[PDB]
């Protein structure tokens, strides 16, 4: 049957090089290497006995530029033995990961045994064949109305959460993680904490246990105190575990990659060590491809029932969309859930600002039997009236409420009862998509049918 595993049932010796010809920053430059392999995980053995992993990055003939994940602090030329494993970094995956807590590099930290591998998969992964991809048309009844009815989430959606430093992205991402469920029929979850503080790590690791998800969530916790470069391989490890689960055991995985800005900062702090092309704002030029290698490991594939949803939480610095991390994340991903600092200050939970929020899989998974026929038109009409209300609120703050027209006053009323009665929601209150659409229609009934310039006449007649 499974003859593939037997082919790897062999022994291969490894070369131990005590030939470190220098080291500078996080880069260890070897010499006299016997046929170096580009991107081969390498186990360094420090003089003190500490074993630091590292992967080759440049293999100029008979020389290897090994970058170490844990940092070069303590590496000696005449004492370190650098041992070449002869194969790229691989995580030992199995169906037994689900329910375990791993470190940044995949070494379990739950006082449990090493993963009884069913197979070893290269963490970099491979680009899924675009002919084998399936467009995700199965919408997820997320539970939060601001997402379910506007900026809708499909199954293979890769929709990040954009949030400022202090906004409750974790609370929202936990609510989506705990209430997500297919609208017209659970999610295995894979987590990857990159640079989160211990408070956030414990919040997630406790919310999963509280909701019972921890029986089917594998956590890759790379906290702030973990090595900075390990955050490069943490999301690749998480997505390789998720790819195994989904596309091989046919599970529906909801991958969460918290603090993707920390991963981007790790990319910048590694590129600046190699003096690479500085792109924009100091982030490397190839950071588009580096983030794409992460995000594109999502979506359903043909012939396999599995699917990987992604919700990479992102912390926008200074709450600026134009920053390279949110900008390239918006270009690569298929949506965004913009958590708004202004809304959070106003006190609304969830502080989702639907105007910058987007979902590119909402033109599908809407209408007919997937959801009520009014969804597609109602979401657009809500967007239009919300924007009109925002513009009229600015005009009011400038000139005064006396100059607001009848339409502007209606927009103000709609905006108020929208932010304070449609975006707002209990932390543990889940709203079905039909109930959210009914509330949206209740809001829309402020306007007469004439002012609703976006709803089709048939939809207006049937539902207004």
Partner 1 sequence: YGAIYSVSGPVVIAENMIGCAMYELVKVGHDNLVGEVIRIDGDKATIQVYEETAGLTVGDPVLRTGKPLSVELGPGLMETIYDGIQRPLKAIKEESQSIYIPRGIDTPALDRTIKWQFTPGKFQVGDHISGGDIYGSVFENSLISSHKILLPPRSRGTITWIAPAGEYTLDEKILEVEFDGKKSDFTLYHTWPVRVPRPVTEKLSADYPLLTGQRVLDALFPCVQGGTTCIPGAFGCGKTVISQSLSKYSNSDAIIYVGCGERGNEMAEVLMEFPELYTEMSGTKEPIMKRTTLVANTSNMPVAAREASIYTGITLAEYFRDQGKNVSMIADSSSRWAEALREISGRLGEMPADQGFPAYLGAKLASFYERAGKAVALGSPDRTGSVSIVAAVSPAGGDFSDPVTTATLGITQVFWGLDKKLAQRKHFPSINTSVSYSKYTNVLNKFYDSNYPEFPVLRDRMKEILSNAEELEQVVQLVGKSALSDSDKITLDVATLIKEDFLQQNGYSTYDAFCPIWKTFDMMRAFISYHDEAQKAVANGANWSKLADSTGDVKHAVSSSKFFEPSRGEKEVHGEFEKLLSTMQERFAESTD
Partner 2 sequence: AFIILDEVIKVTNRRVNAIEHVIIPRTENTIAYINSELDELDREEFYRLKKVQEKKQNETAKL
Partner 3 sequence: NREQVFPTRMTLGLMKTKLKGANQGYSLLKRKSEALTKRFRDITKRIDD
Q: Per rule CB under 8 A, is residue 207 in the interface with partner 1?
A: no
Considering only the stretches 28-36, 125-133, 207-215, 360-368, report the one whose residues sit in contact with ligand ADP under the rule CB under 6 A.
360-368
With respect to partner 3, which residue has the nearer C-beta, 224 or 384? 384
* Contact of 338 with 314, CB cutoff 8 Å: no
DSSP code, position 2:
-
Question: In this structure, are residues 205 and 87 in contact, taking their beta carbons and an 8 Å threshold?
Answer: no
- Could you say whether residue 454 binds ligand ADP (CB under 6 A)? no
Q: Minimal distance in Å, beta carbon 161 to partner 2?
A: 24
Question: Are the C-beta atoms of residues 85 and 123 closer than 8 Å to each other?
Answer: no
Task: List the single partner that 340 binds among partner 2, partner 1, partner 3, none, CB under 5 to 8 Å by kind.
Answer: none
Minimum CB separation from partner 3 for residue 398, in Å? 5
The breaks in the chain (C to N more than 2.5 Å) occur after: 185
Q: Does 63 bind partner 2 (CB under 8 A)?
A: no
Tell me how far, at minimum, the Cβ of 312 lies from ligand ADP, in Å.
16
Residues 59-78 that bind partner 1 (CB under 8 A): 59-62, 72-78
| Range 363-392, binding ligand ADP (CB under 6 A) | 363
Q: Decide if 351 contacts 343 (C-beta within 8 A).
A: yes
> How far apart are alpha carbons 307 and 156 in whole angstroms?
6
Is residue 62 within a helix (H) or strand (E), and if so which, with residue range?
Answer: none
397 binds partner 2, rule: CB under 8 A: yes
4 belongs to the binding site for partner 2 (CB under 8 A)? no
CB closer to partner 1 out of 55 and 424: 55
b/e code 186-218 from CB counts within 10 Å (16+ = b): ebbbbbbbbbbeeebbeebbebbeebebbebbb
Of 303 and 400, the one with the shorter C-beta distance to partner 2 is: 400
Residue 138 CA: distances (Å) to CA of 161, 250, 364, 451 = 20, 16, 8, 32
- Residue numbers 265-284 binding partner 2 by CB under 8 A: 275, 277-278, 280-282
**DSSP for residue 401:** G
Binding-site member from 362, 433, 443, 455 for ligand ADP (CB under 6 A): 362
Return the structure tokens found at 56.
């080759």
4 binds partner 1 (CB under 8 A): no
Query: Strand, helix or coil at 309?
Result: strand
Q: By CB under 8 A, is residue 318 in contact with partner 3?
A: yes
What's the burial of 275, exposed, middle or buried (CB within 10 Å: 0-12/13-18/19+)? Answer: exposed
Look at strands 23-24 and 15-17 and give their pairing.
Answer: unpaired
Q: How far apart are CA 69 and CA 105, in angstroms?
A: 9
**Which residue in 81, 94, 292, 439 binds partner 1 (CB under 8 A)?**
292
Q: Interface with partner 2 by CB under 8 A: which range of 70-78, 145-153, 366-374, 390-398? A: 390-398
- Which parts of this chain interact with ligand ADP (CB under 6 A)? 360, 362-363
Interacting residues with partner 3 (CB under 8 A): 318, 320, 391, 394-395, 398-399, 403
Q: Which residues contact partner 2 (rule: CB under 8 A)?
A: 275, 277-278, 280-282, 394, 397-400
């Amino acid at each position: 049957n499974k003859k593939a595993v037997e082919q790897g049932f062999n022994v291969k010796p490894r070369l131990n090089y005590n030939t470190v010809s220098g080291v500078n920053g996080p880069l260890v430059i070897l010499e006299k290497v016997k046929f170096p392999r580009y991107n081969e995980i390498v186990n360094l053995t420090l003089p003190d006995g500490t074993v630091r992993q590292g992967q080759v990055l440049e293999i100029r003939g008979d020389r290897a530029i090994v970058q170490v994940f844990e940092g070069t602090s303590g590496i000696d030329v005449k004492k370190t033995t650098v041992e070449f494993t002869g194969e790229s970094l691989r995580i030992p995956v199995s169906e037994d990961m689900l329910g375990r807590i791993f470190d940044g590099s995949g070494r379990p930290i739950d006082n449990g045994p090493k993963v009884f591998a069913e197979d070893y998969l290269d963490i970099n992964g491979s680009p899924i064949n675009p002919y084998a991809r399936i467009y995700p048309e199965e919408m997820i009844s997320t539970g939060v109305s601001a997402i379910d009815t506007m900026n809708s989430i499909a199954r293979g959606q890769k929709i990040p959460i954009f949030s400022a430093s202090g906004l409750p992205h974790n609370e929202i991402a936990a609510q989506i993680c705990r209430q997500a469920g297919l609208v017209r029929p659970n999610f295995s979850i894979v987590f990857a904490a990159m640079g989160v503080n211990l408070e956030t790590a414990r919040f997630f690791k406790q919310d999963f246990e509280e909701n019972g998800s921890l029986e089917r969530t594998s956590l890759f916790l790379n906290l702030a105190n973990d090595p900075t470069i390990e955050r490069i391989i943490t999301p690749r490890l998480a997505l390789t575990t998720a790819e195994y689960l989904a596309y091989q055991t046919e599970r529906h995985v909801l991958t969460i990659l918290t603090d993707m800005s920390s991963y981007a900062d790790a990319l910048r702090e590694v590129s600046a060590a190699r003096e690479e092309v500085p792109g924009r704002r100091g982030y490397p030029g190839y950071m588009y491809t580096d983030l794409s290698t992460i995000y594109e490991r999502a979506g359903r594939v043909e012939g396999r029932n599995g699917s990987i949803t992604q919700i990479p939480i992102l912390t926008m610095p200074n709450d600026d969309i134009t920053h390279p991390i949110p900008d390239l994340t918006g270009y690569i991903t298929e949506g965004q859930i913009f958590v708004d600092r202004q809304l959070h200050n106003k006190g609304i939970y969830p502080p989702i600002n639907v105007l910058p929020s987007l979902s590119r899989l909402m033109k599908s998974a809407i209408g007919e039997g997937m959801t009520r026929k009014d969804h597609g038109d109602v979401s657009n009409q809500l967007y239009a009236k919300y924007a009109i209300g925002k513009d009229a609120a600015a005009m009011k703050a400038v000139v005064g409420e006396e100059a607001l027209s009848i339409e502007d006053k209606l927009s103000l009323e709609f905006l108020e009862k929208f932010e304070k009665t449609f975006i707002t929601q209990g932390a543990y209150e889940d709203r079905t998509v039909f109930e959210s659409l009914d509330q949206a229609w209740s809001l829309l009934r402020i306007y007469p049918k004439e002012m609703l310039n976006r709803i089709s006449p048939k939809i207006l007649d049937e539902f207004y």
